[PDB]
Amino acid sequence: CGRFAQSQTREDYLALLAEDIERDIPYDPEPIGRYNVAPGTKVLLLSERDEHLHLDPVFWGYAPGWWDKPPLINARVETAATSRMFKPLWQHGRAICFADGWFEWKKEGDKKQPFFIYRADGQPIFMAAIGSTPFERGDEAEGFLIVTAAADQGLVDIHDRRPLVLSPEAAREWMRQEISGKEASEIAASGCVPANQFSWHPVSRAVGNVKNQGAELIQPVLEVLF
DNA sequence: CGGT
């Protein structure tokens, strides 16, 4: 899930999670408009502090000072809660990245065909994230990662891993500062949306170029024309 | 010492 779409208005995503009384997020009617969100950019990221939900632009990537490789963008659910690298983020840096769906590239010979994957029921996805607090500092090296899970059922035809997508109810619980890392592991297990709830289709190869951010990038295409 |  090295690219995803976050294109609609803030209210389109937030309405499933909390009413205004629980938010500390200014009203803004403008669609976010990003059909092709990429690592290393700042992404509007949802988290809880001071008993309210906050939305901060946070760098997608995590590279502490001792990390001498490109920033990581994912953390595996199987191990993140106990990892020497990710455990503190799992405990105190949990967050949600909302989106319309995500992209994966299926290997087809020596070519790579992108697909867009989304909920068949038409709800946005609430992707489980972990990251470096305080998020509001706007760090350009230590931001957030999207937690991943194994692909299952039809999804394995496309790619072997997928974002850990949570139900709206589980997403709200995941963010709470009062719940422990162990309770968060329980939420990740119980709230994960199963593979059979997703649909997908091939999309234009144009999504590979981050200059492109338009709505056509999520439209179904004939693979033969690419 | 720490990963996808």
Side-chain angles (χ1 to χ4, degrees), chain A residues 37 81 144:
Chain A
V37 176
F144 75 97

Side-chain angles (χ1 to χ4, degrees), chain A residues 4-14 25-38 41-46 55-58 96-100 124-126 212-215:
Chain A
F4 59 88
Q6 189 188 77
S7 70
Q8 301 299 296
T9 71
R10 285 159 179 77
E11 188 62 33
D12 290 321
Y13 303 106
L14 293 169
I25 300 164
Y27 165 78
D28 186 337
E30 191 176 337
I32 297 162
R34 305 179 68 189
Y35 289 88
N36 188 9
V37 176
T41 71
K42 285 179 170 171
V43 185
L44 292 169
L45 186 73
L46 190 67
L55 193 65
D56 306 292
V58 181
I96 290 286
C97 190
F98 48 67
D100 311 310
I125 57 174
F126 297 106
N212 298 318
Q213 296 294 326

Side-chain angles (χ1 to χ4, degrees), chain A residues 21-24 47-54 172 177:
Chain A
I21 196 172
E22 285 191 73
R23 304 182 196 176
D24 201 345
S47 63
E48 184 195 281
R49 62 178 177 274
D50 183 55
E51 307 191 315
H52 292 77
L53 301 184
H54 288 254
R172 182 68 194 89
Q177 292 194 292

Side-chain angles (χ1 to χ4, degrees), chain A residues 128-142:
Chain A
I130 64 181
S132 169
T133 51
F135 288 126
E136 62 268 28
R137 75 191 193 273
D139 207 273
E140 295 278 19
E142 290 174 87

